Each structure stands twice: as C-alpha cells, then as structure tokens.
Design a protein around this ligand. Structure first.
Ligand SMILES: Cc1cc2nc3c(=O)[nH]c(=O)nc-3n(C[C@H](O)[C@H](O)[C@H](O)COP(=O)(O)OP(=O)(O)OC[C@H]3O[C@@H](n4cnc5c(N)ncnc54)[C@H](O)[C@@H]3O)c2cc1C
Ligand SMILES: Cc1cc2nc3c(=O)[nH]c(=O)nc-3n(C[C@H](O)[C@H](O)[C@H](O)COP(=O)(O)OP(=O)(O)OC[C@H]3O[C@@H](n4cnc5c(N)ncnc54)[C@H](O)[C@@H]3O)c2cc1C
Ligand SMILES: Cc1cc(S(=O)(=O)N(C)CC(=O)Nc2ccn(C)c(=O)c2)c2[nH]ncc2c1
Ligand SMILES: Cc1cc(S(=O)(=O)N(C)CC(=O)Nc2ccn(C)c(=O)c2)c2[nH]ncc2c1
Lengths: 465, 465
C-alpha cells in the first residue's frame, strides 16, 4: 500500500500520541504507527498500572502498621491477585481512552512496525499481515527505551524486567532488586507490603541518588523501617539462575558476598531504542551515550525529523515526553511555542508512601554551579494537616539564589507531596521570586502550607517554625 | 500590675498569635491576651481536631465500602473512641507549639480576659485572680466569633453546637444537622461513616451554597449515595428537646413536617464577638451586620486599633486570619505590606470525601458582574491517578476573563483537591494568564494534571479530553 502525510509519529506512547494530537489541532495531516502498546509503556505496563498497585500497597501499609493508632479492629487478608486485577482494568481503560483521542482528532492509526527507508519514507510491517509504504514531510520519533541489564547478566525464568514482573499475578517469597531508582523502590514498596522478602542493591552510595541527599536518607530509613534491606555502594557482579533459587554475587569495599532469592528484578536503567528500524537509512545522528540527539525544539540533525520522549534520553518521564511532543508539533506548524530549556528544572515524583517530589537543582548542585545559595527547610512535624492524616514525617526543602530570591530547586518528601510542585515550577518558569511567593495565601490546614513557610524562610524568618 | 507594650493582641487564635509573631519579628514589644484557647477555636475545637476525625472517617469509607474492590478479605471495624482520642492528642500537640512560638519570639503571654477601658488601656481579669492594666501604642483585636442559633431556639442537653459535639467521645444513634455549610457537611461525613443516621437541613436551595452550583450538585450526590439525607430549601421553625428525642419542625413550600432524632447540631453560621469587652469604651465602630469595620490595612475607625480574623466577618477562615494579622503588624511597623483586596479571591477548602476546593468567583458570579467569561471543565474520569487511587469522581472547573485569559475563579471537587489551589491563586495575584499557565508542566500521574488540561481548554483545545 501507499500513502502520504504531513506528520508521521513513530510510537504511540505518551510522547507520540500527544504529539499527534497537537499536530492534528494545528491542522496537519497526521498518522501514528504502533504495533503493540497504544499508550506505550506508561499506560500498559508503566505509570498507570504501577500506581494502582502502589495504592493497594498503601492500604496494606496503613493496616499492618497503624491499625492501633486509627482504632481498627478485625482479622483480614489482602489478596494481591485482586490488586493485580484492578491494575489491569485501570490500564485497559486508559488504553481505550487513547483510541478515543486518536479518533476524536481524526488521526490515522497504522498498526505495525515502522522502518526508515530514507529521510522521508517509512516502511511499515503490518500486524494483520502485509506491508505499507508511508511518506511524510515531517517525522516525529517517539520509540521509547528498553531495560538496561547488569553487564554480563541475562534474563531467564527467575530474572526479569519490570514488564514480566508487573504482569505477574502471583508473587515470589523473596526478591532481589538491582537498582534503587524510582522504579526499584516502587516495586520494593509494593512487594514488601504484600509479604515478600525484598533486598534492594544500588551501586551508588544513596537510594534514589538523583534526589537531594536529605531526601535519600529519609526514604532509606522509611524503607528499612518497612522491613526492606537496602545495600548502597554495592556492585552487582553476576546473577546465576538455578531454577530453584537465584544467586546474586555482590561486592563492597573489595569484599564479595552471595545473596539468594527466588527471583531477581533488573531495574538499573533504560537505554533509548535506536536499533532495528533504519535510523541509519534516515541519517539520524546519535549522541555519545547512544540517544537520539536533538536541539531545544526536539529536532535532530535532519531538520524535518524530531525525537521526543525517552528516546532522546533527556529526562525519561511521561509528562516530559508529552511536553516535548507539543514543542515538536508546534515547531513543525510554525506555531508559537516555548522551549523547555534546562530539563533539570522539570518536575518528577516517586509514588511510594511517603512520596518524593522535586524539581530543579539539589542544594549541592546549586552550590557546585556557582550560585549564592539560600535554603529553607520545614518539617511536616510542624504542619497541622500532616498530623491530621497521621503521617508527620518528611519535610519541604527549597533552594534559591540569594540575589533576587529566584527558585533554583525544590525537594519534598512526605504524604502525597507529589501534588505540591505546580506552584514551584510556575514561579520558576515566569521569574517569580520568594518575596512574591510568600504573599500567596495557602489554605489551612494543608500540606501546601509547608511551601508558604519555606517562602517566609527564604525572604526572612518563618512564622510557624 | 502596670505594663506598656508597642502592640497588644486580644485573642490567641490563628490571627492573633501570628500577628504577634510578625510584630515581634519587626522589633515591636508585643503581648497577647487569651483566657482559654491558645491557638483559638481552630487548634482546640476547630480545624485541627476536625481534620483528624475526617481522616479517620476517610479510612472507614475505604476499608468498608471499598473492601472487596481493594481485595480485602473482610470489613474491619473502626472505634470512634480511638478516633476521638487521637483528635485530642493532635490538638494538644499543636497548642503546645503555639506556646513554643510565643516563647521563641519573646512574646509576653497574659492569661486572662481583656476589657477596653479607653482607646489605649486594657483591663485584664487574670485567670489566677488578680487584675492587670495594660496600655499600648497599638491594639490588634482578634477575638473571633461565636455560633449563631436558629432564631427562637435554645441549646440544651441534646441540642448542641460544634464545640460540644466535637468534644463528645460517644456518638448518638441519629442526628439532625441545621446548616449545610462546610462545618455541617464535615460533621455529617464523620458521623455517617461511624454509623449515625444523619439528616442535614439547609435553608438555601443548595448544599455548600457558597460554592459553584456544579460543585453543590456533585457533593449532594456523593453524600446521598453515602446514605445521608439532605433537605434543601427547607427552613427550621422550632427545635423541641424532649430528653429521649428531639423534634425539629421544618417547612418547605408552605408545608410543615416534624423530624425526630436523638441530637441536633446547630451549624447555620457564626457571629463576630463584639459584646462584653468594652469596644464602646475604645470607640470602635461596627458594621450593619455587627462586625468590626476595617479598611484594606485592617484599621478600625480608631487609627491605632486593628481588627483581624473572624471578628471582622470578611472571610471566617484560619489562613485568612493569619494573613490579616501579617498585614496589621506590617502596617503598624511601617514595613512593606500587601493588602488582600477582594477577599472573594482567597482560597478555601472542605475536607470531607470528596474534597471541595475553590477560590475567586463562581461562573454565576463572574457573569453577573459583567465579565466576558470562558470556562474549562475537566472530569477526573479522564485522569490517570484518580483511577489509580480508586476515586475518579469530580472535576476541575476554571473561570477566566476572555480578554487576556486572566483567572477569575477556580472550583474543584474530588480526591485531595484541597492541595491544588496554590498554582491558581499565585497566577491570579501576579497576573499570569491561561497562556502562561498552560506552559507549566505538571507531573504525571497526578490529580494536578487536570489543572493543566483546563489551562489548555481556556487557551484552545484540551489534549487528553
Ligand atoms: C514500571 C514503570 C513505572 C513508571 N512510572 C512512571 C510514573 O509514575 N511517571 C512517569 O512520568 N513516568 C513513569 N515511567 C516512565 C514512563 O513509562 C516513560 O517515561 C514513558 O512511557 C515514555 O514515553 P515514550 O512515548 O517516550 O515511550 P514509550 O511510552 O515507551 O512508547 C514507545 C512506543 O514506541 C513503540 N515503538 C518502538 N519502536 C517502534 C517502531 N520502530 N515503530 C513503531 N512503534 C515503535 C513501542 O512499541 C512503544 O509502545 C514508568 C516506567 C516504568 C517502566
Ligand atoms: C469545627 C470547625 C472546623 C473548622 N475548620 C476549619 C478549617 O479546616 N480551615 C479553616 O481555615 N478554618 C476552619 N474553621 C474556622 C476557624 O476556626 C476560624 O476561622 C479561626 O479560628 C479564626 O481565628 P481567629 O483568631 O480570628 O479567632 P479564634 O480562632 O476563634 O480565636 C479567638 C480567641 O479570642 C479569645 N477572646 C475572645 N474575646 C476575648 C477577650 N475579650 N479577651 C481575650 N481573649 C478573648 C477567645 O477565647 C479565642 O480563643 C473551623 C471552625 C470550626 C468551628
Ligand atoms: C500520559 C497521560 C495519560 C492520561 S490518561 O491515561 O488518563 N488518558 C489517556 C486520557 C483519557 O483517557 N482521556 C479520555 C477522554 C475522553 N474519553 C471519553 C475517554 O474515554 C478518555 C492523562 N490524563 N490527563 C493527563 C494525562 C496524561
Ligand atoms: C494556623 C496554623 C497552625 C499550624 S500548627 O498547629 O502546625 N503550629 C502551631 C505550628 C507548630 O506547632 N510549630 C512548631 C515549631 C516548633 N516546635 C518545636 C513545635 O513544637 C511546634 C501551622 N503549621 N504550619 C502552618 C500553620 C498554620
């Protein structure tokens, strides 16, 4: 078959399908090619299902630890199979929503796998058998990333990635998780609350090493109190699957040690998908770290080809993919757009309980980049709402530049703190300083009150602390 | 006793003790007079214990009605006595924090009841017996408000206000709540979840009549599905306490009916405290509704006397009392301050399930005042986190001016929406329009994403809806 489009999107993840919607809004003939996951990893086996499981795990946590505090009585069991069932129903509903949005915007769905023939032609191997040739004036690459394995290791029946694990309705008696990033910590939180013995191994000296160091130590303590064994500054050397048990050999300070569990989860990182679909035949250049290179407008070395989402490796998150897709579409249409700038200023959150939420530079990074840093730290022990909900742990930490009080970063750990970033990222984008932020009245009693107290600390002295 | 201070504050509620803190930070000799409640109504018998009880009630709803959906083998029991005990423990902890803040800022506590002798003299009947004569350069009246009763009715053993009810460890079998404001609805939510038969009567034709009409319909539906009987456009004629039962005669459409229950809660409104402490001797003028009149800087008609908090009746909320206290202190000291202007723009929230959160003008009010209005509404059924937590009900509704997209109001109902207001009020006060707001990236998956989609709808078309 043969067809031609103004814009062709490769991949239907959060970046791709939002890129297609914006292009359609701008009056561009648009098609999107996807062979497997409509909504990509996020909606099928990522953000959507994992957060439903985290909610279920949270309820187990409340009951097993705080039943006395909340005056709860009764003998009950929590079935993980029902938790799994609900996560699949929630995922399937949002996948349907993606199809609704494609049709609403009159976007052509092409069900197959695309390979670049040249800089303007794409060959599609169709799922329902057959082949089709699609040409385009512009292309938006949104092919995602894949799990990076520990060097030397392989996958097997008892060594898995997030995909086989999140799709498992039955759990093992013990698991060893390689990687203390957000993914590894979230799985550890779910499995531990449902009775699994969990050990997490991280090569770097802190769990969640991308976060501010104060956040790392708070989350490590919470997870250890939850019963999770956390080994930081520890290197994984090998993984031996023996069917009846998996032996993991690790090293710390030159000493070797063998760990054993029924299963192992590989969660050390994700590599952009760049092989097997003709990036060479299109002339697309990769970076030194094997991600598709792009400029501020998500444009590759080829001017009419863009790369958005996890494949450019800038910040592998769903809301980042969506944003990059909007920039790309508005650039193609010559529309008014706004570049994202330094991707470190973008927000991010981890949805174990307590949540972790942050944007911008850590205190250490701000000082290491020559800023005259001012810091304000408010503990949730001085927050009325945090005591009301029964979780007074955590803090809000804001980093600012002393000259005008412009925000450099924010780092939160506490109950449902993920919802508190919008005020901070807005002020940072539009040059609102702490002296203006401190005048914004926050509703009482809310966790967000901790933000206001931090503003008072950046410009002067706190009031309720 | 005979002492003099630059600033004397009357009442230790959120307005009084924050105003005292700000005065101290500004180098003013400050004293504060309180006979009963340090932290006022809010910390002792208001915001603080109320939100602890509402947390307990939230957990009852999750673990009983949603037990099988979350895979719980049975329905556990919640003991209200333990919920009461935790609420008193939380309240005590925050009251102790106020005393800590007074000492930290070197503020002089005067334990007694103050009465004005003239415009510069306060006679304090000390709790420990004696009397003290306090003179001042400036005074800050922060005496709060008291419950309004239905005309012609009286308090008795089975007819109570918020204060007696929130301090009860044992619940009745049935109750009739007069008034469907935020306080009436919250008590109704707590008591209903703990097994009480609840009927709420409201004179106006909508529950939560101060919110946007759309919000009222949603919350009425949720409360009715919860088992609460709601009678609107219904007037209370009489309340007859007969020991073993209370008979409440109500009328709707010229038709009378008798409602019977074990107890009755009066929650129709609150009247500023203006009697019994010598406002006449100080010459402070009252409004036509019997509140202390103030200008934008909280000054009364007497240039050196101020009135903050509920006693001025502008907006009877704790965070409003705090902000007015900061304005009063800064004005007294001659420091840079920012008036609150139109108080309808300040935020507010109600903490039942679902939460209700709003600021600014309703759609009905905005049109009524001549604005050319644009409205964007996003339902949480299209939000990924809402399904994950198990509550996709509610919506986000933003009202903006069509000339430049300036925000006029925002109205939210749903899971945890109380925490989502800071971004909205920040943009409204520093003149950020829907165009700038739409560019602020929101973390995925959060409830706050529905805010960003609303921004898109105001500027053009929504993406995920
Ligand atoms: C367990 C887990 C939990 C996560 N939780 C969160 C979270 O809470 N928040 C968050 O922001 N992020 C989260 N993430 C990350 C999130 O999933 C990714 O950032 C996001 O999915 C990236 O979107 P994308 O469109 O760039 O790529 P993807 O979502 O991976 O989509 C790429 C798509 O392209 C398709 N494709 C690939 N090659 C081709 C080709 N040649 N032709 C056609 N189609 C092709 C693939 O089939 C795939 O469906 C999570 C990830 C995991 C694994
Ligand atoms: C059940 C309930 C729940 C509430 N929940 C919330 C909520 O979630 N959020 C919110 O924002 N608001 C809430 N409120 C409202 C909140 O309590 C008030 O808005 C707030 O307390 C007002 O503070 P204030 O300092 O102005 O007055 P108050 O807090 O009432 O303090 C006034 C103080 O002045 C003292 N006083 C009076 N006369 C004198 C005198 N002559 N001499 C000396 N001292 C004197 C009184 O003893 C009292 O302690 C709630 C109220 C109730 C009843
Ligand atoms: C990455 C992502 C995913 C979702 S989403 O997973 O919730 N989703 C794909 C949206 C959705 O389903 N829309 C609709 C609309 C109408 N009708 C009838 C539907 O059936 C479905 C996000 N929501 N908001 C922000 C957002 C971001
Ligand atoms: C109306 C109100 C009440 C509280 S509050 O009820 O939480 N409170 C009175 C603050 C508090 O207790 N501070 C401290 C500080 C130090 N030490 C050692 C303490 O013991 C207690 C609010 N917090 N944030 C905002 C806010 C607003």
């Amino acid at each position: 078959s043969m067809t031609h489009y103004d814009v062709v999107v490769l991949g239907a993840g959060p970046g791709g399908y939002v890129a297609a919607i914006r292009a359609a809004q701008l009056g561009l003939s648009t098609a999107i090619v996807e062979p497997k996951y409509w909504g990509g990893v996020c909606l099928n086996v990522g953000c959507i299902p994992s957060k439903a499981l985290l909610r279920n795990a949270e309820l187990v946590h409340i009951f097993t630890k705080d039943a006395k505090a909340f005056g709860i009585s009764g003998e009950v069991t929590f079935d993980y199979g029902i938790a799994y069932d609900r996560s699949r129903k929630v995922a399937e509903g949002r996948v349907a929503g993606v199809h609704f949005l494609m049709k609403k915007n009159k976007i052509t769905e092409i069900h197959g796998y695309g390979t670049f023939a040249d800089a303007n032609t794409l060959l599609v191997d169709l799922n329902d058998g057959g082949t089709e040739s699609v040409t385009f004036d512009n292309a938006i690459i949104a092919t995602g990333s894949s799990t990076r394995l520990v060097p030397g290791t392989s996958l097997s029946a008892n060594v898995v990635t997030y995909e086989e694990q999140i799709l498992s309705r039955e759990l093992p008696k013990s698991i060893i998780i390689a990687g203390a990033g957000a993914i590894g910590m979230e799985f550890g939180y779910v499995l531990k609350n449902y009775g699994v013995d969990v050990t997490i191994v991280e090569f770097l000296p802190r769990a969640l090493p991308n976060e501010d160091a104060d956040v790392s130590k708070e989350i490590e303590k919470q997870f250890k109190k939850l019963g999770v064994t956390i080994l930081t500054a520890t290197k994984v050397e090998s993984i031996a699957d023996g069917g009846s048990q998996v032996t993991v050999t690790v090293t710390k300070d030159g000493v070797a040690q063998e760990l054993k569990a029924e299963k192992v989860l590989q969660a050390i990182g994700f590599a952009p998908n760049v092989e097997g679909y003709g990036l060479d035949k299109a002339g697309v250049a990769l970076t030194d770290r094997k991600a598709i290179g792009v400029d501020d407008y998500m444009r590759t070395n080829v001017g009419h080809i863009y790369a958005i989402g996890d494949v450019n490796g800038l910040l592998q998150l769903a809301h980042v993919a969506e944003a990059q897709g909007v920039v790309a579409a508005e650039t193609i249409a010559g529309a008014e757009t706004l570049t994202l700038g330094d991707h470190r200023m973008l927000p991010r959150a981890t949805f174990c309980q307590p949540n972790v939420a942050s944007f911008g530079l850590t205190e250490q990074q701000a000082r290491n980049e020559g800023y005259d840093v001012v810091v304000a730290k408010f503990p949730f022990t001085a927050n009325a709402k945090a005591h009301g909900v029964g979780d007074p742990s955590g803090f809000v930490k804001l980093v600012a530049d002393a000259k005008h009080g412009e925000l450099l970063g924010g780092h939160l750990v506490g109950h449902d703190v993920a919802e508190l970033l919008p005020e901070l990222t807005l002020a940072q984008r539009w040059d609102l300083t702490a002296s203006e932020l401190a005048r914004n009245v926050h509703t009482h009693p809310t966790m967000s009150e901790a933000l206001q107290e931090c503003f008072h600390g950046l410009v002067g002295h706190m009031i309720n602390f």
